[PDB]
Each structure stands twice: as C-alpha cells, then as structure tokens.
Design a protein around this ligand. Structure first.
Ligand SMILES: Nc1ncnc2c1ncn2[C@H]1C[C@H](O)[C@@H](COP(=O)(O)OP(=O)(O)O)O1
Ligand SMILES: [Mg+2]
Lengths: 357, 149, 357
C-alpha cells in the first residue's frame, strides 16, 4: 500500500522515476536526473503573483472590442481557466502516489503549485475585464465546445488514478471484487502512466500554445496589455512544464529508467500518435468555433490552424513520434517575442619609391 | 464603421478583404506571414478611412519585413505595390488596351503625339500581343518603388 | 470514483469542505470560508528562498561547538528534515482527493508547496555546515531514535489514504474483496480524516515548535545565526499552517460545515485527547535523546519538557480539548522574539496676605 514515509532505507539514486519505493527523506544535495532539480530552481526563480501586474487599463480595451472579438477573448480565457484547473490538482493526485525519487516528487508539487498561480491570475484577469465574473465561471463546466475536451483530458488522469488505487490496495494479480473478477497488471499501470504523460504533454505543449497565440495577438495590437503580461509569465512557466514531461517521456521511452518501459512505450506508439493527432484536430475545430462570427487583425481560422500544424510537428518530434502534418514555417513569427527572453598622415617616400609605374 | 473605397463609395469594414489580398500576394512564397504583415501595419481604423491609405500602410509593413531569414518578402511587397499601382493608373487590376491607353495619354499631353503618327491602330494592337503583363510579377520591391517614384 | 474535473455544474459555495463533489473549476472570486483565501494570500507574500540567506558563519560556529552540542543541533535538524519530508507530500496525497471547495484545495497545495521550500532549506543548512551531507541524510532513515515517530505521524496519513482509495473504488457499503469482507463506511472515513487533521495539528503546533526552541536557543547565544534566520522564516510559515488546521478542525467540530461531522467529532473527543497527549509525551521522549550527552545554556531536558506542556495546553485549548497538564507560565519567554513579526518668578503678595498663619 502507499505510505507517506516508507520505513525501508533505499538508495534514492538507484530507484526508478515511477513505481519504485515511495520517497521517504526529501533531500536535494543529489539527483538521479538533474533536469528536475534545474526545473525546480528555474520555477522558483520565476515566482510571480498576479496582483503585481497592472491590468486596470484592460477593461477599457475589452469594452471597445467588437462583439465577436469579445467572444474570441473570453472563449480563450474560459478554455485556459479549464485547463489550468485540471493542471492545478491533477499532477499532485495522479503522480505523487507513483513517484519514487525525491527530485521528481518535489518538481511535481512545484509544477502543481505554479498552476494554482495560473488559476489565480485567470480570476485576476476576469475580475478586471468583465462586470460579473460569475457569468464566465459558470459557463466553463457546461460549455459544449469546452466540455468535450475537458472529459477527454481528465479521463487519462482519472484512469491512471483508478488503476493506481487498485495497485496500492490489491497489488498485482487476479482479484475478486464483489463477484466480478479484477486483474491488476503493473504493465497496464505503466501503460496508463505513459499515455497520461503523453496527453499532458499535448495539453501543455500544443493546447495552451494555441491559446497563447490568441492572447498575444491582441497584445500585438497594443490591446489587453495587462492580460498579455500575465500570459507572458504563464508562457514562461509553461515552457518549463512541457520540458518536464518531455524528459519524463523520453526517459521512459529510452528504457534508461525501466527496461520493461522501453518495450511498453513502443506498444503505445500508435495510440500516442493518435492521441496527439486527435489533440491537434480538436484545437483546429476550436479555432473554427472561435472565428465563426469573424476574425481580427493578425489571426483567423487559417492562420491559427496553420499554427496548430506547425506547433504539433515540433512537439511530436520532441517525444519521438512521426510527424502528422506537412513541413511548414512559423505562420505567426511575432509570437516568439512573447515566449523567450582621423587619418594617419605619416608617409614614407622611400616605401613609395619602390613603386614602378 | 465604414471605409472609403477608391470610387468614393463607402461600405462597412471587412478584414477578409485584407486577408484575401495578402493571401494572393503571399502565394507560393516561403517563410512569409499574412499575420505578421497585418500586425506590423499598426493600422489605426477611423470611420471613413480611405481604402488606398490602408493598402499603402500594409505595403510599407511587408516591405520592412525584408530580411535574411525571410527574403521572399521582397516579392510579397512588390506584388502588393504592383496591385496598388494598377489601381492608381487604371482604377482596376487589368490594364487597358495599348491603343486606348496611348490615345488617352496623348490627348492629356503626357505622351508624345508622334506615337499616333508613326504607328497605326492595327500596329498598336499588334504590339499589345507582345506585352506580357505577368512580367510585373517578377519585380522585387525595390524595383517597384523606383518605378513609381 | 475520483474525477479530476467533475462534469456536474455545482454551487461551490454550498459544498462542504470535504467529501462533497470533487472540485472542478478553480475560481478565487468567491469563497465559502475566506480564512483559506487569506492564508493563501499570506503564504504567497511570505515567499522566501533559502539561498538568499547568509549561512557562511554557521560552518565555523558548528565546528566550534562542543560535541554534545553538535548532537543537539544536528539531531534537531534531522528531526525537522523528517517532519517536513512527510509534510511535503502528505497534505497533497491525503487531502486533495477529498476536498470539495476550491479555496481549500488551493490552500492545501500552497501549504504543501511551502513545505518543499522547508525541505530544501534543511539541505541548504546541512550542506553548509558538514562535509558530507550523505552522512546526515542516511542517518535519518537508519537511526532508530528518529524513525520511531515517523510511524506515529505517517500512520494517520496512511490509513486515511487507504480508506479514501476503497471509498473511491467501491463506494459506501459492505463489499467482499478476495473472499475477505470489507466494509466502506463514510462515517468511518470522516472519522479518519478528523483524526488525521488532529495529528497534523499536533505535529505543526507542538512538535515543530519544540524544535524551534532548540534552534533559537543557539541564536540567543549569537551562535548558528544563519540557521536561525532560516528557522525564523520557517516558523512564520508554520504559524499559517497550524492556523489552517485549527480552522478546519473547529469548522468540522462545530457542525457549521457538515452536521454529521459534529457528531463524529464528539465520538473522537477522547481519541483526539489521547492523540495530543501522546504527541506531547513523544516530544518529551525526544528531548531525553537530545540531552543524553549534556545540555547547554538556557536549555535542558527539564526546561524543554516544561515548554512541551506549556505549548500543548495552548494548542489543545484552541481546538476545544481538555488541558492535560498543570497550568504554568512560559518557561522560555525569550522565544516570543522569534515567533512573530524651570521656575516662574512671579509672586502675588495680595494672594499671600489672604493666608492665616
Ligand atoms: N471593406 C473593407 N475593409 C477593410 N479593408 C478593405 C475593404 N475593402 C478593401 N479593403 C482593402 C483591400 C485592399 O488591400 C485595399 C485596397 O484594395 P482595392 O481592391 O484597390 O480597394 P477597393 O476594393 O476599395 O477598390 O483595401
Ligand atoms: Mg477591392
């Protein structure tokens, strides 16, 4: 079963990332994988609060927008509030009961904590842009275009949480639970983790960056500049988050951590590819909904969908998957601004006399 | 809000008109961005804004995006500028017949009248078959600005 | 089962603190209990990093200490590393699957995140005073004198985590799991949460404050002043943490949040009282190990045990429990410093003659 302080003395440098002995003593003088120590330090150095950004002049800009541009802004803001709502709690609930090295345990909690700052900033943005924040928040759970992806994203988490509970309560084997037969396979648990991390990677490396394009496009018109400063801080955090899942996935895929895992990751390659392709398709349809009533300067359905294909190819290659879309150049290059930050008069007649004209 | 067309008439603003003209100018080019041109224009729309001022603004924006990383902007800005110069002289994209143009220009005193004395209408129509107006699509932006300037 | 984004649109202002519908949308424009919003805002404003504190003098002072005072400092430092190792992960693992209002969910993650800074500072202190930090960290798990109470605190966490998993997988009722019959009682689950929160309160309000006395005693002699600066920042955080559990306990006990909970808190009143007294007895037992080789100016076994009884009475009364020890004044009053923040010459002869001698 899961224990909050395992009694066995283990060498934490030799444990795997997941499914080993639960971490007991939290030490930060040594790491098996120093990428997560660097991610913690980088995240701690980025610590920001939403209230330290001036968002007062954003209300003027929002009220002046056309009606279909209010819809684009608010739909993108509702979708962001949803995703970082899931991300606020899910890494803690889903990964902490599985982690067996301290540096990855602390990163997941730092990762999850920084997501709560993101959720707090969305309330800060909403509170300073609309008159009744309840109108926006109440629509997030019932929204037809959002809910289809909320259940899809959360299901990978939910299935991993469920198998983990069975694995802690019953252990590996074939079990009987109220008559019905239940098989708990550690190999199947490793498959639900790998698929979940893939879904989380596409969530933070594709879904959110499509959302950044909408937020930063308004800022390129010098509008919603308070929101854009906060989204810039979020995007700086988001780059760290997707780097974490990239290293987790590649370490699992390469078999460095678990010999069994390299083979399991190969059996999932087709399901992971379909997972990313479906994620890309869902965002294209989301862009189709965003611009149904019109577009704006610098962003329309084609431009945003082209960015979906551009950003997906980059992410899928980073985790060793086949490219589903055609090679393309960055359709919105302006988004990179937001994601990364006396004459010497002496003459010698003798030297000139050496000249033969 | 309304813009003022080239013929003087007014109609409410439609960004798809700007999207379409940019998609045409960027067709076949590598490493160019319709989004970048519109955003770098920093176009300040006011009610009654001239549609020709809008086009001149996005020509300057695409022209200033010429760089080592995206050299094909030299053709995007040229195609936009050629399009703009066609409207200024003809009110449309397709140029008129060579004879009809020469007659109007000699009467306005802008061409030398010897053209109508040394060439017949049948000869002017024969030189119109020599002309390939698609060769305006082979200029770079610097070429067009020297042409119009 | 547990879901990371419950698809039911519910009024979060009307949910209970625990066991209600899992939190879906993370919003901070409204709270059922604003105490947790104030705690979040206050914890975020206290954000500090260990590396920004000068500890260079501390290596010299520690090496110059008598050997029996080295034992006091490092044993108290090992014990602190142990407790905040449990506190780093446990509120996240044990409480997040149960919380049903967003302000309390975010506070638990802010609470847990701040504990990882504590764990990181213990590494910062250790690595700057000893030559091989591995000797210290490995001794936390292998020393028999420390590990015994790891079992005390972690058992309340572990049992709540286990019953929570059964409650999510099977639901309430009598179930048969591999022949053996298993009963899932929501009333017994609420009883395990209340007992757990009581144990965590005694951990942060009693166990850690006994540890603060040792660190600050060295500072009153102008020794180990770099460690004392860090412990002061930790103690400021700890004051927020124990205020959190106090409000959770009192809200549950009063029946304001859940009427069923008030009845359960009455059945546990004796079990909770025994839990707090045992915690105090264990800290008395720990003080016997700290001073087995000698004492120091201002602190010995007698003095520290008096502080245990002094601080226990205060904490237990705050949560409506009977005082187990005799009333006494603060035996170390110096610790409060660290746990907060011509002649007028005029004469009137006529007035004088109206005087009778
Ligand atoms: N309603 C509208 N709103 C905004 N821009 C427009 C518009 N109609 C045309 N444009 C843009 C597209 C062209 O790049 C530019 C002028 O091109 P044009 O086709 O010569 O002008 P027009 O259609 O006004 O005669 O103005
Ligand atoms: Mg036109």
């Amino acid at each position: 079963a899961y224990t909050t302080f395992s009694q066995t003395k283990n060498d934490q440098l030799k444990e795997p990332m997941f499914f080993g002995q639960p971490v007991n003593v939290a030490r930060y003088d040594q790491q098996k994988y120093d990428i997560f120590e660097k991610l913690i330090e980088k995240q701690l150095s980025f610590f920001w609060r939403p209230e330290e950004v001036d968002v007062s002049r954003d209300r003027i800009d929002y009220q002046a927008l056309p009606e279909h541009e209010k819809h684009i802004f608010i739909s993108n803001l509702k979708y962001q509030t949803l995703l970082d709502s899931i991300q606020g709690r899910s890494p803690n609930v889903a990964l902490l009961p599985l982690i067996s090295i301290p540096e990855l345990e602390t990163w997941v909690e730092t990762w999850a904590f920084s997501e709560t700052i993101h959720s707090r900033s969305y309330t800060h943005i909403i509170r300073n842009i609309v008159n009744d924040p309840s109108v926006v928040f109440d629509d997030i759970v019932t929204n037809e275009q959002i809910q289809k992806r909320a259940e899809g994203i959360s299901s990978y988490y939910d299935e991993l949480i469920e198998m983990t509970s069975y694995w802690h309560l019953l252990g590996e084997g074939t079990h009987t639970v109220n008559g019905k037969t239940v098989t708990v396979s550690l190999r199947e648990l490793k498959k639900k983790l790998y698929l979940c991390l893939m879904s989380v990677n596409a969530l933070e490396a594709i879904r959110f960056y499509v959302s950044f394009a909408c937020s930063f496009a308004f800022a390129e018109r010098e509008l919603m500049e308070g929101n854009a400063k906060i989204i810039r801080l979020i995007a700086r955090d988001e780059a760290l988050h997707l780097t974490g899942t990239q290293h987790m996935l590649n370490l699992l895929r390469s078999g460095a951590d678990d010999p069994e895992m390299a083979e399991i990751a190969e059996e999932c390659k087709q399901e992971c590819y379909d997972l990313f392709v479906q994620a890309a398709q869902q965002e294209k349809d989301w862009a189709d909904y965003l611009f149904r009533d019109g577009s704006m300067i610098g962003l329309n359905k084609d431009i945003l969908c082209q960015y979906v294909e551009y950003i997906t190819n980059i992410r899928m290659q980073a985790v060793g998957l086949d490219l589903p879309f055609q090679t393309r150049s960055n359709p919105i290059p302006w988004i990179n601004t937001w994601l990364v930050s006396q004459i010497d008069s002496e003459v010698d007649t003798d030297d000139l006399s050496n000249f033969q004209l | 809000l309304l813009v003022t067309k080239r013929d003087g008439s007014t109609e409410r603003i439609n960004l798809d008109k700007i999207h379409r003209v940019l998609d045409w100018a960027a067709e076949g080019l590598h490493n160019v961005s319709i989004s970048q041109v519109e955003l770098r224009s920093h176009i300040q729309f006011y009610d009654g804004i001239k549609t020709s001022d809008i086009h001149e603004t996005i020509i300057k924006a695409a022209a200033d995006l010429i760089s080592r990383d995206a050299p094909d902007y030299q053709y995007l800005a040229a195609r936009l500028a050629i399009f703009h110069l066609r409207k200024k002289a003809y009110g449309q994209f397709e140029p008129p017949a060579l004879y009809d143009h020469v007659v109007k220009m000699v009467e306005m005193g802008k061409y030398d009248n010897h053209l109508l004395e040394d060439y017949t209408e049948e000869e002017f129509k024969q030189m119109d078959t020599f002309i390939d107006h698609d060769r305006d699509m082979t200029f770079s932006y610097a070429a067009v600005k020297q042409l119009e300037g």
